[PDB]
Design a binder for this molecule. Sequence first.
Ligand SMILES: O=c1ccn([C@@H]2O[C@H](COP(=O)(O)O)[C@@H](O)[C@H]2O)c(=O)[nH]1
Ligand SMILES: O=c1ccn([C@@H]2O[C@H](COP(=O)(O)O)[C@@H](O)[C@H]2O)c(=O)[nH]1
Ligand code: NA
Ligand code: NA
Lengths: 256, 256
Amino acid sequence: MELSFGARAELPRIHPVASKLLRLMQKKETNLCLSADVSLARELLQLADALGPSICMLKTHVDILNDFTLDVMKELITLAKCHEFLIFEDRKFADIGNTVKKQYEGGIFKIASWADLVNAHVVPGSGVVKGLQEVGLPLHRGCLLIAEMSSTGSLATGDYTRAAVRMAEEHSEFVVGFISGSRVSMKPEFLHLTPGVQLEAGGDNLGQQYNSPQEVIGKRGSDIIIVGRGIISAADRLEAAEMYRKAAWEAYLSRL
Amino acid sequence: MELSFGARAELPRIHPVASKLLRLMQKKETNLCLSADVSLARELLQLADALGPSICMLKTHVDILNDFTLDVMKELITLAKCHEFLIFEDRKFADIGNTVKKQYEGGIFKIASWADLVNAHVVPGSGVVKGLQEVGLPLHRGCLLIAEMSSTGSLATGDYTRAAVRMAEEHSEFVVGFISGSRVSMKPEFLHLTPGVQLEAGGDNLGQQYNSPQEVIGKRGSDIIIVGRGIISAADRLEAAEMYRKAAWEAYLSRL
Ligand SMILES: O=c1ccn([C@@H]2O[C@H](COP(=O)(O)O)[C@@H](O)[C@H]2O)c(=O)[nH]1
Ligand SMILES: O=c1ccn([C@@H]2O[C@H](COP(=O)(O)O)[C@@H](O)[C@H]2O)c(=O)[nH]1
Ligand code: NA
Ligand code: NA
């Protein structure tokens, strides 16, 4: 029935980026994505180096990096290759296809040049994916579609979520999975990544809501936890990352 | 019943940014927003200078400007003040509140420092607005909510559109209107801006769909047309802008 990450990495219809990710998840016993929500390049790189062994993925918001340069991203790639994790820019492309292709390839960030994965909202219709994939397919990249959100009042529910699943499953040459709160596709080739995760109950004062790794991986069937402040705001970010890694990994093993 | 732009600028509940815009629209007889979808700063600035007298607003995507600097945006502000138009960064904020506040204030673009207006998708729930307004209210800025999209397969329909209207009307200290294809709010204090506009029928090969100024302003009741390629790709962008300005202005007068 359910397959391990290592077996999912071999599925006939697996995308190469998903396969690479699934293999390193199994090798390293990690299904943790660090949300590296910092404004300094030095802190980003120090976190990537120290936490690299503990993570399958590092998620960026490079538009909050006060001292972004392309050379910072070259350094990040070196760490990603060393420690074996993917880089996911959480850009939330959400425009018409003709615009998003330029936002993905160009400008000062040149996201496609360094991000293994990006994500998109499905609200514009499938042209958002078609535009991205024109840049992403030649660059051998993957994309995640936002099927659900963690925040209070999210409209990514019901028929909207179903539309995201259909759009992913119809663009499988580029779309490798979802941002979601739970398993939303029954096809094991697709990844499920879940933000809004902390060990303790709570939220923030701007609509964020938290659930635990056991809830999201174990009871809701997601694959990967995305954790920002639960790690970033801790004193010892390495031990915090290890606590989240162990939590998510055991929840995965026990559902398997 | 229906009020002119100049009278709407005086409504009791008008936002100061909306009032400023409405007054210059009436003064200059323009309800045209140029979508300055170019990758070179020199072309952006040359368009802003030449077309400034013809437009009420210049819409940017600064993340496609290959040679962005904050000094480019200082030059753009000088032109906006000279010719009297607002600057609208079409960033489509679409994250949780805690993230979007940092994307609006910070990073290399420092959007809030130069953009009169920004926009947001409503899919995350109202925390997206609450996060933005924490930066935007002290900086005396305004925001547009994306209630409908012009592209094929858009999911911004039905209950989603109604949720966008409610979210705007409940955050009127910061939200001044909508991106929409038609009038969606019955409250005249809110602006309606409509992309997907060309004089001729057609679309693009990535899901864009076009309607004419007479259709969108006259028959659908919107306030402002947003025009990119219909102007940008023309040989004489000034005459193209004048054709779109005259079309949108007459459609407004005839519905009034
Ligand atoms: O539905 C979503 C989609 C994305 N994020 C992102 O995931 C991270 C959550 O951070 P934290 O709340 O763990 O600090 C942030 O970067 C945020 O932008 C969410 O929180 N919820
Ligand atoms: O529903 C929407 C929202 C925004 N835009 C933006 O408006 C402009 C349309 O350009 P064009 O098709 O007139 O060239 C682009 O910058 C695009 O990103 C749309 O086209 N449709
Ligand atoms: Na883990
Ligand atoms: Na006009």
